[PDB]
Amino acid sequence: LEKMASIDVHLRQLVPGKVSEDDKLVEYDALLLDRFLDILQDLHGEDLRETVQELYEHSAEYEGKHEPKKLEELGSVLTSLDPGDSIVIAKAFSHMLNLANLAEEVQIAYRRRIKKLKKGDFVDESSATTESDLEETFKKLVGDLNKSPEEIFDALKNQTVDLVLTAHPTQSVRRSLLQKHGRIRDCLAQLYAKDITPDDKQELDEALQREIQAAFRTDEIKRTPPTPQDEMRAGMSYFHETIWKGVPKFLRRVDTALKNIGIEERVPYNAPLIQFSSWMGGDRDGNPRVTPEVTRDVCLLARMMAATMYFNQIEDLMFEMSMWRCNDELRARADEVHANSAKHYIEFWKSIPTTEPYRVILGDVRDKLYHTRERAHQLLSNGHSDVPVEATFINLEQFLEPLELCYRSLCSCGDRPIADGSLLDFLRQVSTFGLSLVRLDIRQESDRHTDVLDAITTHLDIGSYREWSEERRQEWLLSELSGKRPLFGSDLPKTEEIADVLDTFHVIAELPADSFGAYIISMATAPSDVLAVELLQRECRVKQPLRVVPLFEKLADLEAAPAAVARLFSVDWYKNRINGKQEVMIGYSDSGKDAGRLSAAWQLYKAQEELVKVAKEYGVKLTMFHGRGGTVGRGGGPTHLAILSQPPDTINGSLRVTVQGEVIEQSFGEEHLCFRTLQRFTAATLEHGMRPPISPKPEWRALLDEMAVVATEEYRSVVFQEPRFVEYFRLATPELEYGRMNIGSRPSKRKPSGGIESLRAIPWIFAWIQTRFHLPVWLGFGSAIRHVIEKDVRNLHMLQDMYQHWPFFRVTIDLIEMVFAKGDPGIAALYDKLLVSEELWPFGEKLRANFEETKKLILQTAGHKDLLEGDPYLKQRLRLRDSYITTLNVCQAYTLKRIRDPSYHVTLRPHISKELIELNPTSEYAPGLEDTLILTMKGIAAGLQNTG
Amino acid sequence: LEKMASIDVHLRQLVPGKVSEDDKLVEYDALLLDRFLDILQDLHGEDLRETVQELYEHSAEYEGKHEPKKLEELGSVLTSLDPGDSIVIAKAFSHMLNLANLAEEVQIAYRRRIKKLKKGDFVDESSATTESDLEETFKKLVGDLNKSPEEIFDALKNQTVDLVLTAHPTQSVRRSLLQKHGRIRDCLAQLYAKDITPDDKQELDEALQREIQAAFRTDEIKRTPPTPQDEMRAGMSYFHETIWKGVPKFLRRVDTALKNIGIEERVPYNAPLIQFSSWMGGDRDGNPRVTPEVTRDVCLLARMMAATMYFNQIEDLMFEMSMWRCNDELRARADEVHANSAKHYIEFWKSIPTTEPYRVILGDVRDKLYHTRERAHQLLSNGHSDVPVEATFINLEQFLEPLELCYRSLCSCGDRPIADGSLLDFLRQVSTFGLSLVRLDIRQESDRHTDVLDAITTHLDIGSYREWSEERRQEWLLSELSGKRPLFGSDLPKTEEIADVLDTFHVIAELPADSFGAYIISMATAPSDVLAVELLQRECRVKQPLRVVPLFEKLADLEAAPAAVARLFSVDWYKNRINGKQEVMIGYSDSGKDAGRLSAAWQLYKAQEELVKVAKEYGVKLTMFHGRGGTVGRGGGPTHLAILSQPPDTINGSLRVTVQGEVIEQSFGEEHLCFRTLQRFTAATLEHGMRPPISPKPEWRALLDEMAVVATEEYRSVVFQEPRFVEYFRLATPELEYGRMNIGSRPSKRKPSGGIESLRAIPWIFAWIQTRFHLPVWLGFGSAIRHVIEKDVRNLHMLQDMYQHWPFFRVTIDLIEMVFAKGDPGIAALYDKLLVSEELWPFGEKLRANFEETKKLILQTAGHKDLLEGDPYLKQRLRLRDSYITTLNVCQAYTLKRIRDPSYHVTLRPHISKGLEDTLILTMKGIAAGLQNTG
Ligand SMILES: [Cl-]
Ligand SMILES: [Cl-]
């Protein structure tokens, strides 16, 4: 079995050099791959394994020299597979790619930071290898900017970093498989301890193989397209994985860094430097599976998970808190609590003596935590309870008060060190996670609210709120919000949709405010949308109404946004309701779908500038909420510079960002990855408040305005004006298959009969990610740079000045370059040849030329000859993934030709050893061609991760 | 604050060299001491801290040169302390000693093994630094002994090591402090990772200090002398600490070591190589606090703890077990289980689909585990339940069956590797811990059974079972055991004691058999005692009766033991009840109190010889149960050779050993320490089965016979014949204070008006441990070795040959030598000066000379010039503790003079910044914790 000698060779040819001296990535991937291939052989035979390995080697040769002969060879092998073998090959390559991502996480997580590799400017902040840690950022603020430590500490206490978890656009991988990935990562890591004993190393190898096989032998389909509650349970995995333990660890490190510049205090235990919000179960925009009851369910589930974790943690806290000397106040509380009926620690003590007052108070808190979980579970499972609300924690102050009493008391007695142990970690967890871990945002289209108001105004014979001009809408909305009469009752003709909207508001009213974040209006355009939501909130008896957040998606919505926000602040009722705080949401991907990526990036910079102008004019604290697709939505290092790049004063101590589902594993799956994530968010926020990026030279603005015009013209002329483009998009791309299959819970279009305008941005991105073409990300850049270069020979120099000195531009280009690295036009060509009509082939050809031209231009702009010349670590990891992804592409393409064309008979090969073909019985397509397709989609999706 | 610079120096003067190259012990201790003293200064002031540091510095100087002027300085300082400062100093030194123990454990656990330091013979097995690990033991068996790997594996399959956890003779430390010790150990260890980042090292230091203060700032008194359930709760901590996770780890290591000698199989997951038994809540011998309700409570609590640990463990198993391919049998069970009513994993899955059958069956197991804990809890807190016993696991087969089904199924599908992951660990945990973690032994005096039967026979107008000869007792007991008519009813006049015994049997009868181990007859002497327990068990309607274990204590009881056991095997009823398995208990400490330690050691060797002769004659698998005080009861390395030293075939694949309370933290507190404990017990047992120690040369046996005669003559002439001894023992020693104070739950004597015969062995040992004198351990060895040396010039050569070549002798001597290391006659002399009458001073003076002579003779026998010449690591660790313990000694002695004599006014010093009984208790617990185990 000298088979290993082959994969090593291929791997080392894929990543030739070393990206450092602790570069063990090729080693890691070889080890994992060898163990996996042996498992494949032991379960499905020597022939199956030899086939799979020949496929991998061919793919690696392709990602090396990009000879199309290699694609012809891969295809030749893959078409001759009957559905059984096709499923096993696709599954095989999905799992192999997963293992590659695992070795990547280990390598990243243990790479030694090179203090000599820092250049000294902001470019260092674009990679984890040279970015500033917390303390380095403190020293940067103090030295270069001559800020006093007191100013840094004060800035930090009032800072909030709000991470919003959203559902994954495809396979939000099951919590079980995450657990397995963890065990594999740990086995890998421990195998490379430079001090390990032979028997230890043996048992670790056997454990690694054992877990690789375990993960391979779990189905990844069947059952249901998981219900929204299931998707939410899966999203909450990272709290148990890393985040719960990770928050107090990060905060304590902040304490140390503050000590290391002379600050004697710690960050206050109730200060919300970290917050977590969730859309899982709250975003109903174009997702009818998300019902009112779904929202009630995920709210209660969250309250359960939080109470559970607090329950388990408070027992170790009770064991720690064995002191006797205490404050007079706490002694009073102990004697008071000692007057009662001790069920949840009979294994520990028959009862708790008054000589352990801390243990008394804490034991009572433990009792209240148990009753909160039991009552939430009864509310979820029935609808009523019998657990009195007076015996649980209903708001966060009830919970914090006894703990703060213990802390104060301990400090009174000079036991501050004891107080700063498990107790401090507990207080910080209560403050960060509250009673729910996450706060659920609600999201709905503006049109649904307009429908509701129109049904009401029709029911009152006042006219159609829909037909009303925006000024008439505003005037009516204002008179009603200021009025004393309720608006509607049960006697109201409600369509199924209008009933959905109102019932959602009623659910919101019947749940604790600690559970909710923001109500977000998709497709916001005018103040009447926000006012409409505010009115529906009031007239549905939502006692503590949510903050309303407009999501300005389209380009015209962005230009009109600051006018709208000004008009909203200028209204007396709204101005007093917001209490000096406004949060606006921007969607990088939505605006991209509208008007191309370059024009949307620049328009979003300008729109944030104007919104901060309005917020200062009227004295409101503006908070920008960054939706998916952004520069700040990337994974790892790049996030640091992306945040630093935001226009001055757009953050101001409140960062709200979407943690994309395709990135959450790379950012929170591992202990170090999580810590460094929280760190770069906190450090980037803190620094940007005090050290904004340079303001752009006026010529830079004028240039970007012109480029945006040309770029929008090209993007729209292709996507929207070319009549046959929609024909091409349906052939060269599996967009239709994505809409039909059990990959995401959402419909891909808002109106089934519409063109690209009615297509949601996620299937738009996804469709072109699968073919490694990435049109939605780069289309429009080519003609823009081409235009400015021809318009004046010297504009190229200006662009290069921007990339080297203007952060926003550098990060935008950098993102484009990263996406091009995940691109391969040759594969897009394979899809054309197999799936697209002949008279449409030149169309694709022209598109690919644009692809190529743009790439060259981006390179010229970035001053690079190769893609990602400045980040060889990422270039390496990407190349390693690409070798697996390419096979999944070819398999996807031929599987598509096989599905769409039953008149494409192929010379099948004999089946390859023991089955997986009988796990999808009720399939209308072939015995396992639907499953093969789903596998390649989940796989390519996992390999390409994030683009735009 | 350069005060730290002093203590380092003193420490380095205490242990001059390095016992290796990874010897960071002095560094560890210096760090812990510096951090602790800074804490003391921060809580009670610079004056208090400076006082404590002067005390330790002087103590270290004393342990250096042993100048009694150093003791005069210590005393002069400690007497001028009012009770408040006295308490803070005593508490302080107790915790300093604990920190010494913590660093000691870390040093031990991370000491790199030196393979070039092995000499090749059995002496290597007396220290962890050179003992054979599992794999080295295999290669020893295969190469030198020509045992085949098949033979090794079959031997292992059938082997059981049963470790019996007993209540602490003093302070069974609260589970909270065990946890804090864990955090201190972990912080210390990680600070010395040769890869640590500056901020990590900083936060680790702050966590270290924080935890030292946390442990120092908890009271250790008040409330009650904790209830038996409380002491039991504390004893069970080590399952959570290390043992639960640690057992599957060790078993997997066995599997690996087997692969490395060609065995492809794993040790069967249902093989009980490791077992845990408990006395906590079961030993009633001279201990009235242990009632029937206590036994029921610790039983139910135990089943609760186990049910919890299984419950928590099975959720990760459920996440791992996501396969879909399965056996036809398992698939049927999944569809079967899928026909039912899922409340305990709604945070995980709405429900478990039949596409995940393993998860289905396991989820059901999780459910049944939940109902089991809940039912046990309701029985404990109330007395009845409503949780159907059919909805719980009542016996181990119900529990194992679905799990074994999962394993079979996974193997059927070529998923054996997945099966050998979390699932195998789980099976091995069910088999090792069962439904109770531990199996409780019950223990009672034979005399109580005599009382009960005498009330019965008197109630039947047949006469007094007590006045009856032993043969008449036997004959009646046999007639009843072979008979079909019941013995007694509710109409039976029961004294509180007789009602107690019968009620204990009724509770055993009303609880699952899996909860209980062995019924132990203290002061057993004749077959009628065993038979008596058997009958009382039967006529109390105990469905599955316990195995009865006689404890032969006195020397005459040991001589008469094998005759008795032969007589029991010769009776048809007993022969048919035991089913070819017999367990006898021997008490090394018990027999020592009777007749001196040397004679008890030799008598126990010979007695085990005779017991094995008989057990082979009648074809029974004899299991010797080693009570407290043995060589095999030591901590760490020495246990290996002690086990190897037992007479051939006394073990025969079943070792039962007492884990003394004074050793359990050193043996299971840390992950590595626990593994190495389970390992050395498992390896030593396996080897001894196939490689029995040498048989003794007859001149050796004759010499030991003679030495035993002289030794008992001396021990008895001093302890029992000297008329003033009892007066001396009451003054030179805190025995009276121990009996009156809240140190142990047990009364120190069986009959208050008796002499030493009625004094229990534990207070006997403890009393002389407190004064660092240890008379119960070495007294009698002196006159024995002196006698044989004078009788013939060459007998010293014979003794040295025995020490160099007979393991039993080497381990006996070695234990004595270690005890002498923990002795200091000078401190005993201080106690004499303060607390003993003047006309009794030569008496003490004389005994101390005996001490010295005995020590000299022991050294000559072992071929040593200094004590513990062969184990410098232990010599070092002990030397380090001595400096704290000595301060605790001086404090105790002057506190005793102050307590007993209110006519001893002292010039107290002003109280030192932010009630003598509490001080005394502190010093006793402290000296107890520093001396750990002796004899
Ligand atoms: Cl109890
Ligand atoms: Cl649900």
Side-chain angles (χ1 to χ4, degrees), chain B residues 656-664 666-670 672-712 714-720 722-723:
Chain B
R656 207 153 192 265
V657 176
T658 296
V659 174
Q660 313 189 22
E662 40 253 299
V663 168
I664 189 165
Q666 191 194 9
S667 287
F668 292 109
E670 208 267 342
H672 299 76
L673 264 39
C674 162
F675 174 99
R676 290 183 206 164
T677 286
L678 307 169
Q679 191 192 227
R680 71 177 59 91
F681 278 101
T682 292
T685 299
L686 177 78
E687 178 176 357
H688 179 284
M690 294 170 160
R691 187 214 226 197
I694 67 170
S695 298
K697 303 187 180 298
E699 50 266 53
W700 292 352
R701 323 186 57 124
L703 193 55
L704 284 190
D705 284 332
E706 198 181 351
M707 302 185 60
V709 170
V710 176
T712 304
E714 183 185 42
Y715 178 88
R716 286 182 177 165
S717 75
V718 173
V719 179
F720 295 130
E722 281 281 357

Side-chain angles (χ1 to χ4, degrees), chain B residues 103 215 239 327 405 456 500 525 592 662 703 768 843 902 921:
Chain B
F239 290 104
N327 214 18
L405 176 60
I456 285 175
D500 187 88
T525 61
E662 40 253 299
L703 193 55
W768 297 100
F843 190 70
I921 293 182

Side-chain angles (χ1 to χ4, degrees), chain B residues 641-664 666-670 672-712 714-720 722-723 725-726 728-729 732-790 792-793 795-832 834-837 839-844 847-855 857-864 867-874 876-878 880-896 898-904 907 910-912 914-916 919-924:
Chain B
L641 188 52
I643 300 166
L644 284 166
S645 88
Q646 299 296 315
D649 302 334
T650 56
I651 297 179
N652 192 22
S654 182
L655 186 67
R656 207 153 192 265
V657 176
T658 296
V659 174
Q660 313 189 22
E662 40 253 299
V663 168
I664 189 165
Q666 191 194 9
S667 287
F668 292 109
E670 208 267 342
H672 299 76
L673 264 39
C674 162
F675 174 99
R676 290 183 206 164
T677 286
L678 307 169
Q679 191 192 227
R680 71 177 59 91
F681 278 101
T682 292
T685 299
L686 177 78
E687 178 176 357
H688 179 284
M690 294 170 160
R691 187 214 226 197
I694 67 170
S695 298
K697 303 187 180 298
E699 50 266 53
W700 292 352
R701 323 186 57 124
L703 193 55
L704 284 190
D705 284 332
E706 198 181 351
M707 302 185 60
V709 170
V710 176
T712 304
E714 183 185 42
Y715 178 88
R716 286 182 177 165
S717 75
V718 173
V719 179
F720 295 130
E722 281 281 357
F725 178 94
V726 187
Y728 178 77
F729 174 54
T733 249
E735 155 239 352
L736 310 174
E737 283 78 9
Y738 174 73
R740 294 172 190 192
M741 287 189 181
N742 300 340
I743 307 159
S745 58
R746 300 177 189 202
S748 60
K749 293 184 183 179
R750 301 191 191 191
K751 294 181 181 177
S753 49
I756 309 299
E757 303 90 340
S758 77
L759 181 61
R760 310 271 317 215
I762 279 184
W764 180 234
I765 306 292
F766 175 93
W768 297 100
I769 280 178
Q770 292 297 296
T771 66
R772 311 272 300 280
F773 199 50
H774 311 293
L775 183 151
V777 181
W778 55 268
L779 178 54
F781 280 88
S783 56
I785 303 165
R786 200 207 313 187
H787 179 88
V788 296
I789 286 187
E790 300 164 352
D792 194 327
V793 284
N795 282 331
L796 180 72
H797 176 95
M798 187 166 291
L799 284 178
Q800 294 170 335
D801 197 53
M802 288 158 62
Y803 178 82
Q804 283 168 3
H805 303 288
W806 189 11
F808 155 82
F809 194 67
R810 178 177 262 278
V811 303
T812 291
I813 299 304
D814 271 347
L815 195 151
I816 304 304
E817 201 178 59
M818 176 272 289
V819 169
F820 267 122
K822 311 183 175 179
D824 185 333
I827 297 182
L830 168 53
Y831 280 88
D832 274 15
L834 291 182
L835 317 180
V836 185
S837 291
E839 99 262 26
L840 275 179
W841 278 0
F843 190 70
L847 281 177
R848 290 193 298 273
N850 197 335
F851 184 107
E852 216 67 74
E853 181 200 15
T854 301
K855 186 173 182 285
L857 290 176
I858 292 286
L859 290 162
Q860 271 187 285
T861 299
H864 296 162
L867 283 183
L868 298 183
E869 207 161 61
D871 201 355
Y873 322 90
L874 175 53
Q876 161 188 251
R877 297 184 288 111
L878 292 183
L880 222 213
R881 299 191 214 144
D882 281 352
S883 43
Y884 310 94
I885 302 170
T886 290
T887 312
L888 286 187
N889 275 122
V890 174
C891 180
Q892 179 172 105
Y894 279 96
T895 293
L896 285 172
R898 254 122 137 270
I899 286 186
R900 301 173 176 170
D901 190 4
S903 162
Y904 176 68
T907 309
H911 199 277
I912 311 190
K914 175 172 58 184
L916 283 178
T919 306
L920 181 47
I921 293 182
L922 286 178
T923 63
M924 285 190 268

Side-chain angles (χ1 to χ4, degrees), chain A residues 563-576 578 580 582-612 614-615 618-620 622-696 698-712 714-750:
Chain A
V565 177
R567 172 55 172 148
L568 278 180
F569 290 161
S570 71
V571 158
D572 308 342
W573 189 94
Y574 190 66
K575 187 48 155 47
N576 282 287
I578 61 181
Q582 176 60 56
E583 168 174 329
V584 184
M585 183 183 174
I586 52 183
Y588 297 74
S589 253
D590 305 279
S591 305
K593 185 203 69 64
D594 190 58
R597 180 162 208 76
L598 174 71
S599 324
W602 178 225
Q603 189 64 51
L604 282 178
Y605 193 104
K606 291 186 298 186
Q608 293 177 72
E609 273 181 342
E610 301 305 316
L611 282 179
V612 179
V614 170
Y618 293 88
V620 191
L622 179 62
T623 302
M624 299 300 304
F625 181 11
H626 295 266
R628 78 172 291 269
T631 13
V632 295
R634 287 182 67 172
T639 293
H640 206 146
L641 189 54
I643 303 165
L644 286 168
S645 87
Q646 300 296 315
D649 300 336
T650 58
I651 298 176
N652 192 23
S654 182
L655 185 66
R656 210 154 192 266
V657 178
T658 297
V659 177
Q660 313 190 200
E662 58 243 290
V663 165
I664 189 163
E665 157 118 76
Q666 192 193 9
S667 285
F668 291 107
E670 210 267 344
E671 95 144 71
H672 301 77
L673 268 35
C674 160
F675 175 94
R676 291 184 209 165
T677 289
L678 306 166
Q679 188 190 225
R680 70 177 58 93
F681 280 99
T682 291
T685 300
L686 175 77
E687 179 175 356
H688 180 286
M690 293 173 160
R691 188 212 222 198
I694 69 171
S695 299
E699 47 266 52
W700 293 352
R701 322 182 67 106
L703 188 52
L704 282 189
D705 282 334
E706 197 180 349
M707 302 184 59
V709 169
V710 178
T712 304
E714 186 186 44
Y715 178 85
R716 286 182 175 167
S717 75
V718 173
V719 178
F720 295 126
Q721 291 168 19
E722 281 279 357
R724 310 199 71 173
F725 176 92
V726 187
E727 195 168 322
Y728 183 78
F729 176 53
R730 291 170 174 175
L731 299 182
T733 255
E735 155 239 355
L736 309 172
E737 283 79 9
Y738 175 73
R740 295 171 192 191
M741 286 190 180
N742 299 340
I743 306 162
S745 58
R746 297 177 187 202
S748 60
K749 291 184 183 179
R750 300 192 190 192

